[PDB]
Design a protein around this ligand. Structure first.
Ligand code: COD
Ligand code: COD
Ligand code: CA
Ligand code: CL
Ligand code: CL
Ligand code: CL
Lengths: 165, 159
């Protein structure tokens, strides 16, 4: 089956975003210009014991992206393969970086294709300037009182400052 | 809305079921897919550019929105001639990741408004190598599991 009008893709960008970084933000900007709708899907990830609560991670992601006209931020505690269908999304968006865990990305892709075969797995690459930022290293630098303003949006930096003192 | 145009560059010597699987997925996702067949003279392609173009067309002729064009120029210049805003690349577990990042990053310098986008083909086809297809064919091996029937016939005729 096919049609000849504009294909409206709804792209879902899943992650823990603990916290969202300039790396994520750069990727979201690029996705926003390329696609019709972009859904930031913040997973509970309770077994990752996130520093920030789910609602706060969602709130930070919304604040970082509120200026974009076609971006929505939603938290979810369920299986990604089911959530993507609840969200009527047809593409998984993932960040691809020189330091990405390539082995893990392909197990994730192959397995979600088994669970949701009609949802495409797609990778964008972030700016070289931000491609090496790690959410984990941001938390560790912040807890030891490091300047994280170069890695995260100012609101995330403030949330981190309040979080540790 | 407007019709976005997506460019899928490569040498396609020859196009394989791996490329074909990626093209099918791109076809469902995007308004217009342009298969950009690069001349690639320093790779000494087995097939001429015209032959590579013709096979890619024959293999994708059934799709609603896929067009095949050969080019000898700089990819960063060709994409603007073709009015495309996306480079589409195949990402596989055995992909040459170091090369893909140098390529995407250098083209980002030359054509900043063109995104590099990676799709994954079906697991069943992700390990096919154009080079290994040529070598198997030159030695009279069965390549029907790796390429479209039109491509298999052309490889046998060449050898
Ligand atoms: C949430 C999932 C996808 C794990 O993702 P992850 O932990 O890696 O999230 P993280 O916040 O680290 O990053 C998310 C995305 O941003 C990308 N990106 C990440 N870091 C950067 C960075 N500096 N710069 C640019 N882009 C980046 C990542 O590659 C990823 O695409 C997975 O655990 C999941 O699907 N959870 C939902 C529950 C579920 O369904 N589990 C079964 C999974 S099959
Ligand atoms: C043609 C270019 C893009 C190189 O592409 P490449 O050498 O990888 O050709 P090849 O046919 O092997 O593959 C092309 C594309 O198919 C993808 N794909 C390749 N193999 C497979 C496979 N089994 N399965 C699924 N997908 C695949 C590749 O990842 C790539 O995206 C590059 O040399 C180029 O830009 N040429 C134009 C002139 C130019 O601009 N040169 C300067 C370099 S910027
Ligand atoms: Ca039609
Ligand atoms: Cl991390
Ligand atoms: Cl450009
Ligand atoms: Cl090859």
């Amino acid at each position: 089956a096919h049609h000849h009008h504009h294909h409206m893709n709804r792209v879902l960008y899943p992650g823990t975003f603990d916290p969202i970084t300039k790396g994520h933000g750069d990727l979201i900007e690029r996705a926003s210009r390329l696609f019709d709708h972009v859904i930031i899907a913040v997973a509970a990830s309770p077994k990752k014991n996130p520093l920030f609560s789910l609602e706060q991670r969602v709130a930070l992601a919304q604040e970082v992206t509120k200026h974009l006209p076609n971006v929505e931020v939603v938290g979810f505690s369920t299986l990604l393969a089911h959530f993507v269908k609840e969200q009527k999304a047809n593409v998984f968006l993932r960040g691809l970086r020189a330091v990405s865990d390539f082995e893990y990305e392909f197990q994730l892709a192959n397995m979600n294709r088994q669970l949701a075969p009609d949802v495409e797995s797609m990778f964008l690459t972030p700016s070289e300037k931000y491609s090496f930022i790690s959410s984990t290293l941001v938390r560790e630098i912040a807890a030891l009182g490091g300047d994280i303003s170069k890695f995260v949006h100012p609101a995330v930096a403030d949330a981190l400052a309040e979080r540790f003192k």
